[PDB]
Write a protein that binds this DNA or RNA. Structure first.
Lengths: 206, 60, 151
RNA sequence: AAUAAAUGAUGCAGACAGUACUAGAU
RNA sequence: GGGAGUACGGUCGCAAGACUGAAACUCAAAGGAAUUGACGGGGGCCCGCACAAGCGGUGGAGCAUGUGGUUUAAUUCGAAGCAACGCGAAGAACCUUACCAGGUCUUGACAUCCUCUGACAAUCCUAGAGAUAGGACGUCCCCUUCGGGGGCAGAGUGACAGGUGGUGCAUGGUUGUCGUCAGCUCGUGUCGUGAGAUGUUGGGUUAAGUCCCGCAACGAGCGCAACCCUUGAUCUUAGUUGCCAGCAUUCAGUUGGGCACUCUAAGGUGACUGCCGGUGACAAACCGGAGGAAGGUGGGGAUGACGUCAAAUCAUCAUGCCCCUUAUGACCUGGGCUACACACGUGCUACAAUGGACAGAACAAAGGGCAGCGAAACCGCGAGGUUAAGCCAAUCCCACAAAUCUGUUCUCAGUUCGGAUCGCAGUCUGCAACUCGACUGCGUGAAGCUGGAAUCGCUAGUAAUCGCGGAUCAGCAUGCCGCG
RNA sequence: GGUCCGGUAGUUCAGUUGGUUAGAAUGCCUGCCUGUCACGCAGGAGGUCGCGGGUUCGAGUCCCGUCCGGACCGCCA
């Protein structure tokens, strides 16, 4: 047993709901539909480096907000991307689906994409020190009061698997009002599986 | 024997009485949830990930 | 650390007494204070009936008889397991008297706890009684352990 | 008329594995 | 270094022994100082139901449940002191089901691949236990400017699929313990040639390495309190599906009517050492004092610091490696998962007069309701069955809480105690309670009369104890979650 | 070979003599404490009286014969 993630604890304090709707008699059905939608959109845009995707139920209409940090890679020409992204969801769901795409400024601050890039660098055989230090410096120059990154598993050894800590600044997980962005990533290497844990403290709200 | 068990769950049972419940995400019987139809660990992680608008941390 | 405070409820129409209230609090089982109240009321009524006297004085004399003056506390100084007589404060004396009264009354054995407690109060007012056997044994132990009146 | 702070010596607890165990680069 | 101050030899001595003093063999260490941690039956000091005093249990008995032994067609597998044993698993008649007997299949139950032939489905007879076939009725597909495309079924090919197969001594992810204990660290500088220390040591103080003083050190992070939620009191916002007093009506709070007031759901305030005295250094800090609902984190919940246990999970999921593949994979009927000369954890019921049975009476708090919850009426001693109001819910229902009190009655007995085992007859469900639920009535009723070492929980609305609702659920709770 | 003594829980000794009845420790098992052990504590089972006959209502016990393990003599020339 160890610490718990802040994503499930900060709800109601500052962070709003990633899903905003009031359902009835179809709660689990809509939840499963949205889970499938998120799985598909993540597997498709895994290369587009999408951080998170919110959904809103609108009385048979679904409004989806996507934070990608790179518009030209998720909308591109505008037409082909929007078609391929909306008609697929429409056909796989059964009703209208509206998509909205926001761009994350300072893309080096969101834990999701940070862990994604770290896992990509690891899968590229980059040393677990160089990649971690470079990502930490990138985040710190982008602007963050605190950054914590942990990698556990086989970092080149076979008999033993150990963790590594590298963090600068203040990461007060116990402070309720912290707006800490948390996300995890996995990296399947030839020697086994590696897990990346990243929770970034962006700032507190008075 | 996990996806085989999922296909068996999805099979049309002879009698409706023969039907059993599965969380629709993994192959974990033994305390699947009804209200959410999601597995224990799956439901926990998803609620922690901001989904499930209704469920939040409880205190009393 | 240190001691702690407490309080009880005195008012009781049948033979009003703080010690009677403490006794009512005692003998109670399963959170049923009403049963104990009724038992005490009926026992005092039987006492007043059989004996032409107020049950208050009889209860006071029974308490004065059963109350232990000296307590024998064990103490293991080496491989001897000695004992040390102790002066019991009035609160502890009253509590011990209540404990012995209740225990020996329920141990006597009759058709009703009412009659048991009545006969116990009688055999306490008259020094010859079960709880007074315990009192005498405790006094004998304290006397035999007089060698350690003080460490 | 006043009024003293003491007193101290505690009996018992024997053994635990043969072979095992984390790495780092300007 | 051990061999070894040993053996041979020689001198001394009454003797004990003394002096001199090797070799073979064997190991790559033996040893001195100091630094960190660890431990101690060394010392000082502090507190945690730890001890002391008690309230009630376990350990005796019946039952339920789980684990080891033994027995099986299988009794699927994991977990093993604290940190396994009412734990995974919040409910095994099939289904869940993994394990086994039998009947079977092999691009397979499941997802991408390729060539086509076109909708499949849906009703019906035989074998069936069914898998599956023998089959008949029958296939209605659509979209375009004629190629084709969007699924489903089939007919062939191999890439593949399957792994509840092993490795938690390779892992990700998730949790238990120390531990809600208070410590664990970093930048700069200094000292020591070194591991390292200084900051973190010394004094006071706190639940806290919380804070203050001194300070060869100055700052900072993870922690700790803090802001998060709940409850304890108040101002305002609002009175319908809440309340009924003032008003008039009612068998009913049912109607007109009021939002006075509980109440509910919103914004605020409030308790923050806020104020005074004393103590303490004048500080940090502690005792008392008025107010107040709240006095010294008000109570509780969430929040579990670096790391230890090669701790648990390859079984939730992925996972490299290894292994099987017309089988360690897959379909179906039945069985087993529920057997017990046994022993042990946890829980329930009992041994009776604070009692047993019968008559009358009051108060609840929380939660649920759409193939769902189901008023009321009727039938039946009964579990329950029939018609059915109402409710997508402050409306209606679940749902008349029991302990408790006031009476009648029995009487100290293996009993008018207990209801287990038990035979019969029935109720809820479901194709079916036979291996395999619960409940009800009939007739009996033992073990059992307080239980061995030893052991467990509990400092206030706590202990003990009486009922209520939900999860898993067609139907299954002495266990779980909460409430009173 | 001749006299004398015993054959009892798995082991060591009681019980026999008194004819109607089998005991103490050790040992084993269960339980408790202990992280694991020993030590420690509470219980349980376990002998059919070496073997075969005879007096009997009845023999571990009384009287016999037999097989064992022991205590002594098995001499005189």
């Amino acid at each position: 047993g160890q610490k718990v993630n802040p994503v499930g604890l900060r709800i109601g304090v500052i962070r709003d709901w990633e899903s905003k709707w009031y359902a009835g008699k179809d709660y689990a059905d809509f939840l499963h539909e949205d889970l499938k939608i998120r799985e598909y959109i993540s597997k498709r845009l895994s290369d587009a480096s999408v951080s998170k995707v919110e959904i809103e139920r609108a009385a048979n209409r679904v409004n989806i907000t996507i934070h990608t940090a790179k518009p030209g890679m998720v909308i591109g020409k505008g037409g082909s991307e929007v078609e391929a992204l909306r008609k697929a969801l429409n056909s796989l769901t059964g009703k209208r689906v509206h998509i909205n795409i926001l761009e994350i400024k300072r893309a080096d601050l969101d834990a999701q994409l940070v862990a994604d890039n770290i896992a990509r660098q690891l899968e590229n055989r980059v040393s677990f020190r160089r990649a971690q230090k470079q990502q930490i410096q990138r985040t710190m120059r982008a602007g963050a009061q605190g950054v914590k990154t942990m990698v556990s598993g086989r970092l080149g050894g076979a008999d033993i698997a150990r963790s590594e800590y590298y963090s600068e600044g203040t990461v007060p997980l116990h402070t309720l009002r912290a707006d800490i962005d948390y996300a995890t990533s996995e990296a399947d290497t030839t020697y086994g599986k590696l897990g990346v844990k990243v929770w970034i403290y962006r700032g507190e709200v008075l | 024997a996990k996806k085989s068990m999922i296909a068996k769950q999805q099979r049309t049972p002879k009698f409706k009485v023969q039907e059993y419940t599965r969380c629709e995400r993994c192959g974990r019987p033994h305390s699947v949830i009804r209200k959410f139809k999601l597995c224990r660990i799956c439901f926990r992680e998803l609620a922690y990930k901001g989904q499930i608008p209704g469920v939040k941390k409880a205190s009393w | 650390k240190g001691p702690v405070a407490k309080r009880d409820v005195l008012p009781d129409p049948i033979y009003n007494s703080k010690l009677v209230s403490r006794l009512i609090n005692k003998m109670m089982i399963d959170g049923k204070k009403g049963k104990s109240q009724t038992i005490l009321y009926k026992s005092f009524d039987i006492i007043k009936e059989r004996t032409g006297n107020d049950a208050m004085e009889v209860f006071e004399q029974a308490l004065k008889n059963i109350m232990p003056v000296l307590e024998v506390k064990a103490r293991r100084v080496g491989g001897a397991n000695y004992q040390v007589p102790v002066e019991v404060r009035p609160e502890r004396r009253t509590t011990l008297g209540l404990r012995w009264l209740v225990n020996y009354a329920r141990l006597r054995g009759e058709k009703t706890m009412e009659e048991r407690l009545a006969n116990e109060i009688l055999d306490a007012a008259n020094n010859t009684g079960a709880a007074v056997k315990k009192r005498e044994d405790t006094h004998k132990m304290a006397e035999a352990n007089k060698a350690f009146a003080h460490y």
